[PDB]
Each structure stands twice: as C-alpha cells, then as structure tokens.
Amino acid sequence: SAKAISEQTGKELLYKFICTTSAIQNRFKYARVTPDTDWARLLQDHPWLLSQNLVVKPDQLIKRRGKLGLVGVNLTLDGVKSWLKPRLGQEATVGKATGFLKNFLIEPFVPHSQAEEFYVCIYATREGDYVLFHHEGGVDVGDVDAKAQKLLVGVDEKLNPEDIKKHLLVHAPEDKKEILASFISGLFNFYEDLYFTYLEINPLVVTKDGVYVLDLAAKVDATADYICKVKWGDIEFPPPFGREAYPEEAYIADLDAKSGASLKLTLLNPKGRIWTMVAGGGASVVYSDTICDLGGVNELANYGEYSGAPSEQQTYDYAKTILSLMTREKHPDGKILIIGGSIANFTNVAATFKGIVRAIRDYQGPLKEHEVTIFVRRGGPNYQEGLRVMGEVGKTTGIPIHVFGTETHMTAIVGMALGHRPIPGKSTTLFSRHTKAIVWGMQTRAVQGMLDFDYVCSRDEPSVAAMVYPFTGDHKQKFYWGHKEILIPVFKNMADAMRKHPEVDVLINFASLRSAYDSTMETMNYAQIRTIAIIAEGIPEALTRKLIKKADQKGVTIIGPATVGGIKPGCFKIGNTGGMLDNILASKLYRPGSVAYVSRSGGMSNELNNIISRTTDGVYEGVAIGGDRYPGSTFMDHVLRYQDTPGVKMIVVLGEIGGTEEYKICRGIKEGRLTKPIVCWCIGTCATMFSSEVQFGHAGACANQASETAVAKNQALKEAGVFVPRSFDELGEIIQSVYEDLVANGVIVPAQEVPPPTVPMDYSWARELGLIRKPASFMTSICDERGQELIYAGMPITEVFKEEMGIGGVLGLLWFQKRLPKYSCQFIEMCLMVTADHGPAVSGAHNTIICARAGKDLVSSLTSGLLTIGDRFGGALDAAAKMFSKAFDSGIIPMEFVNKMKKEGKLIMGIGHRVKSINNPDMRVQILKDYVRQHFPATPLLDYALEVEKITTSKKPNLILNVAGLIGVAFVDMLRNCGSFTREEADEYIDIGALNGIFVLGRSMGFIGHYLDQKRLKQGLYRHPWDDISYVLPEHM
Amino acid sequence: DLVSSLTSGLLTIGDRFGGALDAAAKMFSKAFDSGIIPMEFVNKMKKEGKLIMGIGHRVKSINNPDMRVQILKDYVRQHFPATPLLDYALEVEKITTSKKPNLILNVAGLIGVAFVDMLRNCGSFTREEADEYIDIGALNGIFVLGRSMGFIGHYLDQKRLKQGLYRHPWDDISYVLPEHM
Amino acid sequence: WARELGLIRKPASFMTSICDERGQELIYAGMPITEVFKEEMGIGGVLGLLWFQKRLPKYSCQFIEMCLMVTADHGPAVSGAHNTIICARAGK
C-alpha cells in the first residue's frame, strides 16, 4: 500500500538521509504554518526568515498549485503574512475535490534561471524502477514519457554513475555532469533504502553554490514500516485534499498495523446514513459499487473491510469504533448498517459476529434511539452461529436486524436497504491428483481441510507430505484421512523435509509478512518445488519484486502474496481455499467442471465458486492471485495456462481497479492467442463516483493513470469480444448464458454426478450443534480456568485481591469453597507460619537434604521429603483433631477421657513435649493460643483440650498441649464455630484430611528452603557411615 | 493419600509444565545482562528458533489483559523502587504485540522478571546472590509452593465429591503395537 | 452409539505401542502373554518386549536379567536406600 507523504516529511527525510558528494543546500530549511499556532514561536527558532526572501505554498498533497495560483513567489515575511490571510483557513476547490487549507510551507526563495529547471522522477514498476530526467523541467516540462530520458534499473541492480552520465545526462550542461549525476545516484540510493515507491522532484535547480529542491511528491510503501520505523520516525501520511481525516481512522490504521489481519476504514461522508461491515477488499469494493449503482454514493458514509480472520477483540473494537462514528449525528430517515461479505474461506464467522454482537450490546441505546437498521449477509466457517447470535442480539436489543445466508446473492441486502426490492520455464499444469505439498508453519486446521478435500476427491494419497515449523523439533502430527488416523512428519528445517520427500512439488508458505520473504527465498533454492503459494499480507513491494525476479530466473510459479491460494477440484487445494468441507460439498468442488476462473480477491473466489457451481457444470480450476500491487503470477500466466489446458472450456476473469492487466487480455485475444470463451468483470466502478482518491483494502487497488479505471477496462473488454456483464449482479446470468450457449453446441459434455466419499463429522462440531452426548469423566468445583477471568470457587481473582485476601483467604476458597472471615484467614496463615520448618533433624527435612545433596531437583527433593509426612511424622495434627473431636462429641469429661485412654493403651494425640514443660512453653503454642483467645468467637474444643492438658500436666510437667494438638483443636473450633460451615461440612473436612494438607503446605516452605540451602552451600553426595549401620545379616541363606 | 496425590501432581512440575517461570526469568536476565536492545533480543530469539519464554497468551491479547498480570504489574509499579528488567520485558512485549496481538507478557514471564527485579533491586541481595538464587531454582520453588495449594484443593474436592476410580476410555488411545515381535 | 456407527470423528489424545490390554488375551508388544510364556523367555524377554518392542535373543534377555541381578542392592548406606529406610521407619 503506497501512501503519499507530505512535502515537509519528504524533504526532511531527504535532508537527513541523503548521501551525496554534492553540496546539498538548504538542509532542514523550512517552516510549517498552521492556523492553530502562535507566530513569534515560529520566529525565534527560525532566524533565517528575515535573512533571505521567502516563498509560501500549501503542503496538503496539492498539485498544480502554480497553475491554480495557490503559490506566492518572491514575497517578504510581511508579504507572506499578508498573503496567508485571504487563503489561510479558507475554502478551496482543486479539480473535483474541495477542502480547507490547514497546512502551509515557508522556504527561502532561490534565484534560479529557466536553463537550470530540472525534472527528476523515480517510480517503481514490476520489472524495476524507472528514472525520468528532463533538462527543460518545471512548468514547461510538457510531455514526460516522450521527451524526458528514461532509464530502467532492474531489481537487485545498482545504478552506477556512468550509466546515468551516458543515458541520462545528454542534454544537460557539461560543467555540471559530475555533481548532478552523483546527486542522482545519491537520490537513487535514497529511493530503495527507505522503500520509496514514487519520488518526483520538480523544479530542481543547480547553481555554482549547490543544488536546491523546490517541490517533491513522494509516495512510500507503508507496509515496509517494520523495516524503516527507525528511519521514518513518527512519519505521518496526510489524507487527500478534501478528506478531513479523523482520529478513528488513525485508530483503525494502528489496529491494522498491530496484527497480520487487515482492518481498513475510511470516512467518506460522516453525515451519511449507510455503513458497511463487509469482509475482504474485493467484497468491500463490490458492495461499494452495488451501493453507488442505486444512487447511494452521496449518502455512503464509510468504506471499510476486515480480512485476515480478525479475532474476537479486533472485530469488537472495529465494530465499536464504527458504531460510535454512526452515533454522532441523527438522520431523519434513519441509518443503515450493512454487515456483508463473501463466503469466508477461513475467517471464523462465529468469532467476528460475536464481537459485532458484543459491540451492538454495548451501543444498543444510541442505536435504538438513532433508528438504525441492520442487514446482514454472510457465509463461511461456522456462519450458522454468527447468523443466530445476530438473531438473538437483534431480538433482545430490539434493533431491526435482518440476517440472510448463502442463498442471498450478496447484493440483495443492498437493494433491501435502499428500498429497491422487498425483504423476504513455468509449467502449464501446476496441480494434479498426485501433487504433494509441504506446509510451512503450524496450520493444522488448513492441513486438515486439505486432507478432507483430498479424501472427498478420492485421492490415493494426502496432498500434504510434510510440515515445516522452525520453532519445534522433528516429530509427527496426527491427522485424519477420512476416518482413519495418519501421521504427517513435521521438521524443524526445510532441508530435511526436502531431503526425505523428493516427490514434493508445491510449497504453501504460511509464514508471516516478516518471514515470507526469507522462507520463499530459501525454498526457491530447491529445484523440486515448482509452485509456491504465499499467504502473508503486507509484504513490502520491493521484497515481492525480488521474489518475482528470482522465481522468473528459476522458473517457479508464485501464487501472489496476500491470497487464500487456489483450488483444483478433484486434484488439489491450497490452504483454506473453498471454506470448510461443507462449502466444498455444497459447491460440488470435489469433481472437475469446465469453467476456470482467476480473481484478485480470496473470498470473491469463493463467491465465484458458488456462482459457477449454481449456474454451470462446475469449476475445473480456480486461482486467486492476491490483492498485492505486484502478484507473483499475473492474469497472463493463469489465462495462458487455462488456454493451453484442454480440460477447460470457458474462462472467467474477475479483476479490480488499477493496473493495465486486462488490456493484456484484450491484446492476447486480438491476434487469437485466446480462443476459448472469456467472461471478464472489473470491480471498482464506484471509484469513478467518489470525489477523492480513496485507497481500497487491496494494496494493488490503486489506479495511477486514467486508463486503469474499472469502466475503461470493462468497456475495452466489451469491444475486445469478452462477455462483460452490466454489473456484478448480472455476472451469474451472463455466465449461465455463456455456459448454455457452449453446451448447446456440444463443446461441453457434463459428466454423471458420482457421490463423493463420506467424511465423519467432527466431535467438537457435533457438540457445538448439540447433536451428541458424552458423559464427563471428571468433576471439579474449586477453580474455573476457562472464561475471561480466573475464578477461585466462585470469586474472581480481581475480587480476590480487592477484598484484601491473603494466603489464608485463597486457601479457604480453594479448599473449603467458603468466604472465611478475616480472623480465620489470619489464623490459617499463622498455622502455616508455625509449621513452616522445625529443623533438619526431622525425617522429611533429612530426606529433602539427602535428595538435594544428590543434585537431583527441587521438585524431587521436596517430594522425597514430603513422602515421609504420615502417621509418625506430620500426622499428629489430624490425629489430635480427630481424637479430641471424638472425645468432645462423646460427652465424657476430660478426666474420664484421660483415664479411658490410659486404660486402653493409646497415647493422647497432641499432648507431650520433650524439654519445654512449665515456665517455658513451646512459645509458638502461646502465640496461636493468644490469637485464638483474642479473635475466635467460641472455642469449646480448645477449652476441652486445655482441661485435658491441665489434668495431664499434674502427671508430668512435659505433658502439655503440643503445636500439633493446639493447631488441630483450634482448626476444628474454627471449622465448627464460624458460620461458613455446618457440623457435617466440618466433620467431612476433618475426616478427609484438611489438617494433613495444612501441615504439608506449611512444611513445604521449610523443605524448599532446605533444598535451596543445600544447593547454596554446594554439598556433595551423602553416604551413611558404616559404623552406624550395624549389619545383622544371617549366616547363610 | 493427600501426600501421595499432591506428590504425583507435583512430579509433573518441570520444563514443559510450570517451568516457564524460571525459564522466562533466566532468558530475560541473560538478555538484559548481554546489553542487547529488546528488538535485537527478539530477532536473536527468532533466528535461533526459540520462542520467547513468558510471552504469549491464548485468548487475552489487548483491551482484555490477563486480569492477574495487571494486578502484579500495578503492584510492582506502585511499590518496587526500580524495575529495569520489567521495563525491558515490557519493551519486548510491545514488540511481540506489534507482531501478534496475543503475544503479551504471561503471568509466568511477569512473575519471573518482577521476581528478578525484587531480588537484585533491593538492598538485601548483591548481584551474585540474586544470580545464584535464580540459578538454583527459587522460582521453581515459588511455583511449586503456589500450585501445592491448588493441588491440595483438588484432592479435597475429589474426596468430598467421592469420585470413583478413573479408567481412561479405550477410544481415546491409539494402539500402534507392532504386528508380531 | 455415534462412534460405533461412524457418524462422528474424535481424535485420540494418547498413543501406545507396548501393551494391548483389550481383547481376548493380553499382548506384550505384538506377542500374546501365552506365547510369551511358550518360548520360555523370562524377565529379560518381557523387559525387552515392553521397552524395545523387540524379540531379543536368549543371551540378551539373560544378560538383562543378570544386569538386574547385580544392581539389585548395594547396601543401605547409599542415598536411595537411606531414604527408603527413613521413610519406612516413619511407618508411611
């Protein structure tokens, strides 16, 4: 997409980045004048204004300024001040477009003669760059293509000075041959270094002091921004005159540049009442022509497109932007919103339409009170869900929404909107049944679709032989051949895939725009690959020309970048062409037909598939060459391929605006090279009715000359003998008429409709439709990983953090599914803190240290330590809790409990310490006990345990309440004393081992700390001394 | 058992599951110490055929961030004195989101870079101590200790629901046994 | 019902090649268990079938058995035996 930059930006870039031996003059010497700024500030930072004379001219991409009298030459500072006022901020009309003047440029007046008025131009073409040099430049330049000297510099070819001196410096003065030539070379080096597509200098004046540039018109390849974002800086692309750009256009441009998907939005008339949601550049263009053919060109508001499978969020953002744009002003008749598009090949209709319905739900109020009516037509993957969700969103919001499916001819909704109709060497053959292809990148959905297409085409082997993904090792990816399971190899390197699969002759490059060039260049080094399909959109034009040059040298056929690919029914399918298997069967693309078509668009290729299937026998082969400016293969390649192909009987060509490519069809037909019937239509007539230079979604959808208009191409094809319909509406009818005329003469003999092989439905598809039942083998109630937000037992994580929960609160949510009070969470945290570690002498810490000193792992060492947590070590928490709970529920007094447990012979769990007996408690039992007294509402089990402790202390001083016993009794009291739990819930949680989890979680901290300490101290392998083992082995066994 | 179930769950904590924390921390620390700019780091990762650890979500891309990367990021901005590696990772995140919208700083990568910043931008540690703690697997322990709560919660949930013995369906397994060995 | 009739198509999430529990007889990597016990292969033969999916010769299976024999135990002082003893004395 070549975008025109302002004169100020162009001269700034030229001054900063040119490298010439000539003394460039007036470097960084200009001034910007805008209505919304002060004046003195422009003075003290520009002292040159008073030093020399001045000249003023509007820099808003306006040409013919001198002929229209918009320039004031040879005026002083006061002169230019007096000159601006009658024009600054005023209304002007250039050509057909009218607009205001918010930008002016001030530069020194250069005293120059007519003899030094030089014309320079460098503009890119498919084969290279044309440089036009005219000695008598300026206003009297006259004809340029017939008088100015022209020089071609090929792709990846340098412009040496002597070629310029000979071919381009014939009529120039001799004394300035050298420096000027150097300047040209430097300017030429400036051209491809910053990926300029058009650079026009007139006038250019050279004097003994140096060189001077007066005006320059520059169009630069915006898609190369990721290569020049350092050198361009914050480059701005001004809108054409009379466009009055808006910040939402900038937002949509940033969204488009932020992702591989294409999101184009251009506000033609904010006061209009017709707005469009049409997916794809070709669909957008044809919808624009359909609207303009009904007289809605004046009421058309915006031109927009979303392609490249936009996601949920991107589509939602674009829809909310357009909805906020259409809410500003209220129209008495109402507003019309058209959600159109072709039959999508791989754009998920469900996700895009879900984003759209979310935006509608967010802006339903203003939409309802604006009387906005929505008409929707869409087809492609999961279009049923999109149509239905539109149905319920329209029903619930009350917005009048009328949705339609594939049965609509893609233009009935426009007629229903405006009240016109009621609302109800390169090879000749590239692919065959034995074609094997290699897919670059993880595109399992596209490969699976290709395999399904091969199966329904009764192919012997799958068309995908290998897959290439540089970010993973070699393995096998599991796919389906019909119903049977197959494995397709996936390689890290292209060389291995080419070595192990010598039968592969096609590459389908799914690499992004940043990797498509390198991948294609590497693939072209292998002679076995005869066809390469590039899917990526946004590749810089110069890189694409480099690919075309290498392919032409090597003879490889490039399916132009930014395409869905192509389809040959019965033989081969590229990528996601033709939609899912349902669209393949509906369009009967599993067997060959007799019509072969070429189109720029990808979704419109599927529309052509549908039209040809409905009106004729079928499709023999269909190719979408892409919407880029320079496709890898033009119309000539594929049309000549079809003409040389005996299988076809008729050809359909569906071009777009810009590019003298259909005139090549006309010239080929002129001497009879093309003999088979041809039906050609060129979309883009709506560009003739617009008072602007709007750039369509396709990069190559830009008409530079006046002969590249759609009307001119259609007319020329009309006298060329091509069956050209009146509009896109009559394309189906004219194609059907041509097919009937051709079959009436016996040229076409339709074959018998053999049913295709049956492919089982996908399980996920059946679940989505609610067709089958499969019981769930699991059940969880603690955490919800799916959804927009992480959920902890009903509480979102953001709500978890806003409520100022801690480890205790999250633990309660995850373990008990309860909203515990603050004191309960703090008590849980304290219990985890006191059980964190108790030294390395215990069994678990010992095992952790042993595993760590073996240099095994953090997880392994923690695991070995934790596996000793059981009855003897770490189970005293749960054992004491159960013991005291049973004693308390039995109702026996503590003395009776102590006597019973003495007589029966089991130790009282949670009672008894070694050294700390009295006047020196455990002192971490004291902390938890004090907290429990302070904060716990009721502690009956704690009081019972304390009475038991008082009884047992009279026996021996060391029989006190342990940390384990205190934690157990206080945890039971917390469970059965707070309102979160009933008695049954607390009993179940105690029985299942909640306190075991408490102890394990607490001691995990200490075990991991022990592992980290052992790693930090760098301890070697431990072997137990033999003197501490005491072998007692038997005498002989 | 509780211990056995927690243990079997924790044994999967390794490179592929739960290892993005330490891997992302080491990757970003090496990138920051090497002195290369974030663009050079991204290009070096792409050339080596390595995915940037801690970058990339499945659904949450823009206008809908992770809702838990945001909380930690806001806390780190508000409380942490200086976060150089966090800024470096955020520049890398900007570049990756310029590539693809859902290539955002994951919770693993965010926690890794913020933990490195907390280690080496507080007065407690010298640079070599922070490097050693990163090397020996401090974030591995952090992830294991955090996910232990969820694993014990899962065990308790399964016990409370009284789920029976699991047997994987035969239709979900592909038997590719040899013809006769 | 839809899987038996082949109306739906669900990819399998697991792949195995060592043992086939289903059917009228247990299979160890292509060889039935009865056949496994017919040619008198022992621990070595079963180990080879399960680990390598190969019919190892008799000397290879006997050598595998000998390797298992010599690595059976090497005292309690080693780290693994020490950890086993520690976990056992905890009565776990």
Ligand SMILES: CC(C)(COP(=O)(O)OP(=O)(O)OC[C@H]1O[C@@H](n2cnc3c(N)ncnc32)[C@H](O)[C@@H]1OP(=O)(O)O)[C@@H](O)C(=O)NCCC(=O)NCCSC(=O)C[C@@](O)(CC(=O)O)C(=O)O
């Ligand atoms: C090209 C592709 C297939 C895939 O490209 P993606 O960018 O998505 O994925 P990636 O290749 O992974 O690239 C992302 C980068 O992030 C890197 N990365 C990943 N993980 C990372 C991590 N963890 N850390 C660091 N980095 C990581 C990865 O390494 C890569 O790095 P890099 O190579 O440098 O870029 C996609 O763009 C695409 O389809 N374009 C469409 C273009 C096109 O043909 N249009 C016309 C077709 S007709 C149409 O559509 C209209 C219509 O609508 C019709 C209708 O409806 O009417 C219809 O549908 O028919």
Ligand SMILES: CC(=O)SCCNC(=O)CCNC(=O)[C@H](O)C(C)(C)COP(=O)(O)OP(=O)(O)OC[C@H]1O[C@@H](n2cnc3c(N)ncnc32)[C@H](O)[C@@H]1OP(=O)(O)O
């Ligand atoms: C995680 C933790 O905090 S550890 C929790 C452990 N839980 C327990 O209390 C288990 C049972 N009790 C114990 O084993 C104590 O912890 C210990 C280790 C102090 C008891 O070990 P001992 O060395 O036997 O202590 P001591 O020698 O003072 O015990 C002597 C007498 O007290 C009795 N006794 C010891 N512990 C208990 C108890 N918990 N309940 C009742 N009586 C006990 C013994 O029966 C013994 O009987 P005797 O009078 O016939 O000799």
Ligand SMILES: CC(=O)SCCNC(=O)CCNC(=O)[C@H](O)C(C)(C)COP(=O)(O)OP(=O)(O)OC[C@H]1O[C@@H](n2cnc3c(N)ncnc32)[C@H](O)[C@@H]1OP(=O)(O)O
């Ligand atoms: C599976 C295996 O067979 S082990 C294979 C190990 N891998 C290798 O072979 C790689 C290189 N090997 C080595 O590191 C060395 O050659 C070794 C370890 C095999 C040789 O052992 P050394 O390095 O001499 O240390 P060693 O194991 O002898 O220990 C020193 C002494 O402690 C004694 N000792 C060994 N184990 C114990 C124990 N559990 N308690 C008390 N004393 C012990 C030994 O008798 C030995 O006595 P010595 O020094 O008089 O011979």
Ligand SMILES: CC(=O)SCCNC(=O)CCNC(=O)[C@H](O)C(C)(C)COP(=O)(O)OP(=O)(O)OC[C@H]1O[C@@H](n2cnc3c(N)ncnc32)[C@H](O)[C@@H]1OP(=O)(O)O
């Ligand atoms: C080492 C051993 O032999 S296990 C020893 C167990 N001993 C005991 O516990 C004795 C008590 N007895 C019992 O509990 C029962 O009699 C059992 C479990 C032994 C017998 O099994 P059953 O109760 O009939 O249930 P079974 O295990 O057959 O499974 C039910 C069905 O699911 C099917 N099935 C089994 N595994 C799977 C799987 N992975 N995927 C899908 N389906 C499966 C079985 O084919 C069975 O159907 P069938 O009866 O038509 O063959």
Ligand SMILES: Nc1ncnc2c1ncn2[C@@H]1O[C@H](COP(=O)(O)OP(=O)(O)O)[C@@H](O)[C@H]1O
């Ligand atoms: N610095 C300058 N010194 C002298 N004349 C200038 C200067 N800048 C512009 N001009 C005048 O502007 C005219 C160029 O107009 P032109 O480039 O044909 O308009 P447009 O760019 O709209 O086609 C020249 O005739 C020249 O005399």
Ligand SMILES: O=C([O-])CC(=O)C(=O)O
């Ligand atoms: O590890 C602990 O918590 C202390 C312990 O069990 C003991 O009494 O030996």
Ligand SMILES: O=C([O-])CC(=O)C(=O)O
């Ligand atoms: O020799 C073995 O079998 C291994 C072993 O126990 C040792 O020496 O560490």
